[PDB]
Amino acid sequence: AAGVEYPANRLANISELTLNEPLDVAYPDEDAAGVLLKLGTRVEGGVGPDGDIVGFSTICPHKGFPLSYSADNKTFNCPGHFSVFDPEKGGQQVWGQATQNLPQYVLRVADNGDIFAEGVDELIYGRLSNVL
Amino acid sequence: AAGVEYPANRLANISELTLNEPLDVAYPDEDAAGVLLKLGTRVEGGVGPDGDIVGFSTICPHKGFPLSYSADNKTFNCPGHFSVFDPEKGGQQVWGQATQNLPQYVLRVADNGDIFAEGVDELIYGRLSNVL
Amino acid sequence: AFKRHIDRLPIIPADAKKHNVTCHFCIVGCGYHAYTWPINKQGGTDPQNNIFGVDLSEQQQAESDAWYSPSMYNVVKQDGRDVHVVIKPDHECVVNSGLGSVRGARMAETSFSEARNTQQQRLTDPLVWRYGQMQPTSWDDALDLVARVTAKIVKEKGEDALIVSAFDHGGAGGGYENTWGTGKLYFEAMKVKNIRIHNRPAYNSEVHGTRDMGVGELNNCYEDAELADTIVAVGTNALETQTNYFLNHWIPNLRGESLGKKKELMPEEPHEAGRIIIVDPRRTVTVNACEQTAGADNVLHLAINSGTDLALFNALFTYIADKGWVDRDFIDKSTLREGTARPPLYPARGVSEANPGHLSSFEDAVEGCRMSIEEAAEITGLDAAQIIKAAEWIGMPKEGGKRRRVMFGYEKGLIWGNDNYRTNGALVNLALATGNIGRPGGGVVRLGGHQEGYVRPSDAHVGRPAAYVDQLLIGGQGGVHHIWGCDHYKTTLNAHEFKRVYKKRTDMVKDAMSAAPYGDREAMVNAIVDAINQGGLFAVNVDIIPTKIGEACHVILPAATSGEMNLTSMNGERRMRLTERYMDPPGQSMPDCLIAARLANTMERVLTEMGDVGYAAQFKGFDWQTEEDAFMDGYNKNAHGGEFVTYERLSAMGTNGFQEPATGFTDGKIEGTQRLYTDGVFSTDDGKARFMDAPWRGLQAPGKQQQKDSHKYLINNGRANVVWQSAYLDQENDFVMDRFPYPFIEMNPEDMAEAGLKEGDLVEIYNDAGATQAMAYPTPTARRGETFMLFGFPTGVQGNVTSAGTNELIIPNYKQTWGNIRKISDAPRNVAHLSFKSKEYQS
Amino acid sequence: AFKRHIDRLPIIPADAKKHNVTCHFCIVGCGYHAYTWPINKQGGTDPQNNIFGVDLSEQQQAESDAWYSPSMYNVVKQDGRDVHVVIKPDHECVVNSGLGSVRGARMAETSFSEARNTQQQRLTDPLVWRYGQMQPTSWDDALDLVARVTAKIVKEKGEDALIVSAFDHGGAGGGYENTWGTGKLYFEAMKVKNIRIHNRPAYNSEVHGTRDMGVGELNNCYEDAELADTIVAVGTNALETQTNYFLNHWIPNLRGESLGKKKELMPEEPHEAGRIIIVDPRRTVTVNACEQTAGADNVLHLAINSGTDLALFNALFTYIADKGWVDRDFIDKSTLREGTARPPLYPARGVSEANPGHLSSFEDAVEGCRMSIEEAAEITGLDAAQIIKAAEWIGMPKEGGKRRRVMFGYEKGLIWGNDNYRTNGALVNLALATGNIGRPGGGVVRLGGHQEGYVRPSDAHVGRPAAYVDQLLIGGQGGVHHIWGCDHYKTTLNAHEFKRVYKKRTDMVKDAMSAAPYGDREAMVNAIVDAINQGGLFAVNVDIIPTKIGEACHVILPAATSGEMNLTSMNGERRMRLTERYMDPPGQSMPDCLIAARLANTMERVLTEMGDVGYAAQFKGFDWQTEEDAFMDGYNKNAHGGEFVTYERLSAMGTNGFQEPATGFTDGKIEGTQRLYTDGVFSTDDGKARFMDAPWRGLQAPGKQQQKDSHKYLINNGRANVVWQSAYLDQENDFVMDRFPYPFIEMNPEDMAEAGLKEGDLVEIYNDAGATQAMAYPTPTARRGETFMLFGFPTGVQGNVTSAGTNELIIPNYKQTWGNIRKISDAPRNVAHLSFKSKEYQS
Ligand SMILES: Nc1nc2c(c(=O)[nH]1)N[C@H]1C(S)=C(S)[C@@H](COP(=O)(O)OP(=O)(O)OC[C@H]3O[C@@H](n4cnc5c(=O)[nH]c(N)nc54)[C@H](O)[C@@H]3O)O[C@H]1N2
Ligand code: F3S
Ligand code: F3S
Ligand code: FES
Ligand code: FES
Ligand SMILES: [Mo+4]
Ligand SMILES: [Mo+4]
Ligand SMILES: [O]
Ligand SMILES: [O]
């Protein structure tokens, strides 16, 4: 009761990620598209030994279009109404129509090398509760 | 799931109340002591045709002692640490150690005259959720 | 990044109370609904238990109506009780079709809530300077003081001693109810000459040029942006500043989504996808988005030298006239054919300061405006090929000899740009010559700023040119100042000098008030008036927050804003709507129209007591108890077709409302006017439009060429998408302030390397007007020597470096500003979290 | 009534991080724990899933540890991450035994939260006055400006040009770390004479009298209130102002709950239930509660005429001495026996201003203080029978000839009352004569205000009497002012005059700064210094919120406060504790000790650049990176027994800590001192206590008799239970502001009837010092002609009507104030919701 109860879900292992190549994932369920991304530099919310593995919702929080990733810029870009998000700065909207910065996963790197997601810092598009 | 779900409970009928004589009651369950009180003047949260029927938790929100009612003063008084609450002013702490004003019931008077409680505007002492 | 950490929101139930709401903010006037329901009741996940009739236990798809963001949710007081509210864009509204901007989508979160602690900055009680500081008091006390001081000064020195600054606009902080109330106070009860508007320092129009020509500035509809062959966007950054007009009407044209519609409404005429000409010195996200939707081949960005628009338009006019690409029958039938002689001081100056340009026939305008492609290329910095291409895109007939439909749109790049009167006319010339007024796919229009909501008594007494109020104040004239809903400290021109003198003059009265006994009110007022006689100023602020200029005022009166009151206004299409009240004003705050009424009543009482019964009588006609009373006394009785409009009737029409003026009422529908001038009869005595003989004469405002020549950088200035106006609400909004704690100044990275500046460095911008601060934001698209600074911003006011320079009609020339830049500090810690990446969407 | 509408709170989980926390606020120093855990994790209802090990799905009984109120919950930043926090009183702490006051119980809710929008008023960045307004900037910039101006002034005019106002207290806004840092800056690096404390306008002690006699003012323990036969409470409203000391220690005595304990520790001595003498002109809720717990027969309320305490005590001393009810062996063994002559100007005046009283032997004190019961009855207004009864309750031996154990406690009724030096001594005389110092059930002590946390270098250079700083400032002297953690605008004496001049003088520097170029910093500093040379003042404010006096300052530096830093202090029992950091400072704010360090470092740099390397060198010894570094350089190296105390060791001792001074360390326990003077060796050169020959000489502060004689009402003043200090946090707390939007003035209902005033009316209080406003609160228990106004309050500052009058040592005589009252306004709308019922508990 009180708070939303987030599940602790395995998303991937650290060995699956290549520098600057986003890995498709879903959290906190099948229907909530996101990505894991290794950025190569220490950044807010980032985990792993280099502190550079982040996880975000990949669905624009304005009107729900799927975001595309620019590798040269390291930004998420929205084809709907031209929003831009920075995963090197906690998903800050560089410019856009969303009243939210990009929802970011609370990640944990296990003992072995598995990456777990245990929460999300903002409301994911298309749901009035992050856990349904 | 959330937003606390209050039950709509019958507490009494308007005909049961005498001017300035509190009627012992319990809401939102058996274990949550309170009173209904007809004050004789229109007051905040008050219902009925004269707008003077109020309902409060009778358990001090500081340390949980049972409140006594003074009829001459129209106040609830706490023997624990000398707090005083005004049911003519939304249960405002006139003076006391509680960081809350007296929790007040959201009342509704039905067509037949029955008084229903459908909510409480502040956290009742001794529970971390108004509905257990 | 700022993150709210709100995992879930209460679901709007099936029985929520629905309110029609127009966006508080920009000209577009997007439609919303506010749903409210008792605190401690809620909706559920099954279709029967929520307002949408949808299963909310499933992820919604893109563009779903069945979702809202946290900034659209709050808890607010309604008739004394806390209620949940969701303010959600309306899918059915033809303006926005469900879109909400980063601004509109946070109306809920920028509303007042004691429950969730939003906007606690909001004023709740009248404040008066006494006992050494600002102190709260009652309305009776505060109004009595304001009335007594005002009445004494006006009796002793005349009404010219009363200076007024007031909104004239629509929407939150304006509207018909509120412009009528203030209007009636200062123009009916009184005859205040020394009055200025919220965005300019005199009582003038922004667009005298177009109006004098017979062409009202809001003549088309938003559908015309969908139907035009070419859109000409001048001095507008529409994606950031008219967002949803751009997204919901311009984009479909550029994408080719409109073709079906174009062919139905205009068969037997060819149609390709829309092309767009953008006239703007700076490459903006608007340019980028057009290129991205239409293709680079269909976007023509004319990156003119700052303030050279008039040269551009004159060249275009000449070329098009010579080629014969003009609506010949429109010119003959609907425009002035009478010759008329140039005034003796032409072309440097007009017949007087009241008339900077010469109105005339097509032929005389062409001869007078004449400029070659080559001369215009020198002035504008454009290539000859670019200017010719523009003329082709505006004037060249389509395949079968059919006239090209062009919608001409302009905003503040033009209006606050060089030679406002003549540039406006030069643009209008193009619309008139090509017959693109009063027809589908046409128009020459303001893209606008605030919504519109103006109705007031005659302003004849004010004069043309009107008094330059800021210069009066800076020069030590005026005794009492009433400030309604604007903040010159952040937003006026020559702002640094203005603040130095305003502080010094209001301080005189503060020191007087602190040293006088308040409880003996006659002594207090005599002390105030003595300070005024010595050159002080007594200042009264009517507002919703503690403002910057309010730190100099002696009385503050708390206003209620849209949503806490009913309010009516029209958008940039003349689409009029009622915003239905859904919450209570905070504390004891009251709507501006009622404040005006209450002030009037106090003036009546006080003057009656003093024994000036004659003057007292002038303040009658203010017995209003609710804002609707102001609507009925103003709009209903005084607007064109007002007799057809009431709250009840507007309410039934919803967020779509109707387009002004009303022409009738049948079967529960106010009948409106889609486009102006469809009959070719214009707003002049004889009904003919005039062209303007408007020759280029350089930078015309005094000081400007001098300032350009003696400083290093252009300090262009304007809006950012996230920030609404002077950040009056945004300064208490973490999402906005987390993104830009300081105002940015967009700088070319090589300009920065040259000056030893790094991203985030705090820099002083300075010139002979004043100085200010901003945060260096590296911007690859910026041209060398050309910076752009966010305007109006509390943590760095760019108005400080704008000069006192205006045109003849006292139009402030904000956009033409030059200055030097130097480093104040290495990037502060509170700026380390910001992204400094490009704002341009990459595909 | 304000209602949060919070239906449920997150449950603290089993694995929450625990922090020891002392209350931020009052002297009692109640124990709390702060529990924190990740946002989006939570506890459950079953015992295994929460910190209490209890089934939380069942209603808890009275006094349960397994509950917390909404004001004890918030969301705060911790090491960069949002976390839940609950700050909950500690059941195991011997101070409070689980009690939390209305103040302490809202530490969480008055903490800074971006997530839940609490206390957004909190400062986040350094601010500097430039470009017409206050503007944010970096630390390097802000510190450079402060250092340059300060250094220039000090070089040109000497250190006397530097004025300082600083906290000297413990707890939030003080503590050992912070008093050391500021102390070291201004007394070690510099030798600042012109320095004042937060609550008084010179660098003096509140209690020179008791100290000069050899009796440190915090000599007992809180257990002694449980063990005394009689408590004598003077000038204290303990239920409202030392709430939990009163509730958890005095009440058990009065109720008879202590008898078991009394008999175990003091067998072979009789014990009845405690009786209490309360010396206070006003009947307070404290008196009411004592009567209600002990019975009216056991409470003796001496409602003395304002400022007549000394008469009372002298009479009591005389009566007790004559009856022989004195500890004869204590007098002979531990007090001065040497005869010593009265100074030539006695009894009107002492040997000098440094020494207002004459220290002496018991016998000489008795002869000098001599006053009959009848003389004291005239002066005090009491009945002879009342004064005799008090003597009996203080001095009369118990059944078997055993001495009566009396705890004498006093606070600001005495300390800010008439003739501070002599009244303090008169009271101490009674304790000394009855042998009630250093023994169980005894003590003559401050009941205190803030917690204590003072350690600083020698202050010898300051002088005695020290400089009256407010008079220097009001007189146009001083150049630079550093204000740390106090707000004279709300809380100084003669405040109305103070504000008028302070504004005028700081305005001079503001106008200079506005007109100068900031980016050229040398020109800016020269402009500041020119304004100072002409009589201006450059003011720097170090604080946590935008303060009132801060509206006059030119630089504001943001502080971190307790909880955002580790902090150490002692309570009124000398009980020292560490408050362990549980959250981050907001924005870029930093602890005061580190601000001081950084300022020192900038002074070193700037003076080095100016070429005064010698003076630069004085500012070394500030290489501190964390608050613990300040603790180790200060307390650890300088306090008595400091070598035994470390953060690590204090942490292991929990909220119970230990009582200072430390005398050793064994097996994880700092060994302390329960009571002072248990050996009968006092704090004088020869180790003997002195009595005080302290004859009554009327109202001694200049102006006071005159002010009394020429005005209608006593304007008594002081605390309210709900309001903490000057409402610096409370002004952004809806629960407090909903109850008292204006400060109340308690008035007798027939005084109100006579004056034509109604409950809630807004009234001006005025006299020859100044004027202010308050809300009439009808108070049946108030005596005719005697009003009580809440002090320090932003919406009506009663310090405005207090005169400049001090005693010889510059102690402000706030409590003796008289003035006239007249109506400003009928009760405002924003006051209609208030209860005006009696604050006294009715059975
Ligand atoms: N996000 C947001 N939108 C708003 C507002 C807001 O505060 N925030 N406010 C509203 C208001 S009140 C207004 S007035 C409108 C303003 O709407 P716009 O006028 O579109 O906004 P601005 O940014 O002032 O100016 C637009 C463009 O003028 C260009 N410009 C500058 N100098 C010149 C010049 O000499 N010639 C030409 N051709 N162009 C030039 C600038 O590069 C800028 O891109 O927006 C409204 N919309
Ligand atoms: S949402 Fe509001 S800000 Fe303008 S674009 Fe639409 S009206
Ligand atoms: S709770 Fe805090 S305010 Fe005083 S009484 Fe205890 S220390
Ligand atoms: S949906 Fe991504 S910007 Fe509109
Ligand atoms: S329990 Fe009611 S006052 Fe402490
Ligand atoms: Mo505008
Ligand atoms: Mo104190
Ligand atoms: O505007
Ligand atoms: O104090």
Residue numbers in the entry:
A (entry chain F), B (entry chain D): 44 to 175
C (entry chain E), D (entry chain C): 2 to 844
Sentences from the paper on this structure:
Since the 3Fe-4S cluster is a one electron acceptor it is assumed that it accepts one electron from the Mo-pterin and then transfers an electron at a time to the Rieske 2Fe-2S cluster of the AioB subunit.
The asymmetric unit of arsenite oxidase contains four α and four β chains. The heterodimer of NT-26 (α and β subunits) superimposes with A. faecalis (1 g8j), 948 matching residues with an rmsd of 1.84 Å for cα atoms (the values for the individual chains are around 1 Å). There is no evidence in the NT-26 Aio for a sixth ligand to the Mo centre. Another distinct feature of the NT-26 AioB Rieske structure is the absence of the disulphide bridge (C65–C80, A. faecalis numbering) shielding the cluster from solvent exposure. In NT-26 the aromatic ring of β F108 closes over the cluster packing against β G123, and could thus play the role of the shield.
